[PDB]
Design a protein around this ligand. Structure first.
Ligand SMILES: NC(=O)C1=CN([C@@H]2O[C@H](COP(=O)(O)OP(=O)(O)OC[C@H]3O[C@@H](n4cnc5c(N)ncnc54)[C@H](OP(=O)(O)O)[C@@H]3O)[C@@H](O)[C@H]2O)C=CC1
Length: 180
């Protein structure tokens, strides 16, 4: 069950299910972590349960999310995620404010502004994804560890931010189950 630990909120699979199953608009943010666990098929399934419940789903892709340009796009296509539901940062970063939930699965650095200050990084000087602008922000990852940038993300401590610790694929699978 959920609970507070340190300066962050640690939710559970059911919390995420309850929150999303009851929202009207969710925006999924896929990152490296999703690729490591090959959670794309589970993720698309989740999107299918939500869409069936009337919820509005779309995906926000950051230019350098993952480990190669367009990495998330091919993974989502692989899971048969409808092409029209995937959007690039420049054409959807402003839609976070009108979204109840921001489902951030396996992403970190692509949401953190503190990550684009290193000039030797592929993300240097690039706009970040505005996940905070949404009602609630779910972060699916194994721990409180940093990303490729090695810097700490300050969104893990926000009020509208709930951490869902676990494997990107395993956790998404539990959430799907909890949703039925
Ligand atoms: N796209 C490209 O062309 C390239 C991009 N890069 C760099 O890679 C980064 C991209 O960021 P983003 O996509 O958000 O990736 P990140 O590098 O920020 O990592 C994402 C997060 O995924 C979590 N994770 C790792 N394994 C798993 C797992 N099995 N299940 C669930 N979560 C997991 C990590 O934490 P935890 O251990 O807590 O789970 C991690 O904090 C940027 O710094 C960028 O510049 C580098 C080379 C090329």
């Amino acid at each position: 069950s959920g609970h507070i630990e340190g300066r962050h909120m640690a939710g559970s699979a059911e919390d995420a299910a309850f929150i999303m199953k009851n929202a009207s608009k969710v925006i999924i943010v896929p990152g490296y972590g999703m690729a490591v666990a090959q959670a794309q098929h589970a993720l698309r399934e989740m999107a299918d349960v939500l869409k069936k419940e009337g919820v509005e789903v779309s995906y926000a892709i950051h230019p350098v999310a993952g480990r190669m340009p367009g990495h998330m796009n091919v993974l989502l296509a692989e899971a048969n995620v409808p092409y029209d539901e995937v959007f690039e940062l420049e054409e959807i970063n402003s839609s976070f404010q009108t979204a109840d939930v921001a489902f951030v699965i396996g992403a970190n650095d692509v949401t953190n502004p503190a990550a684009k200050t290193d000039p030797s990084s592929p993300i240097y000087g690039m706009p970040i994804l505005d996940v905070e602008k949404a009602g609630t922000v779910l972060f699916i990852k194994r721990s409180m560890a940093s990303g490729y940038a090695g810097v700490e993300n300050e969104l893990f401590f926000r009020n509208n931010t709930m951490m869902l610790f676990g494997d990107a694929k395993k956790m998404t699978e539990q959430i799907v189950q909890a949703m039925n």
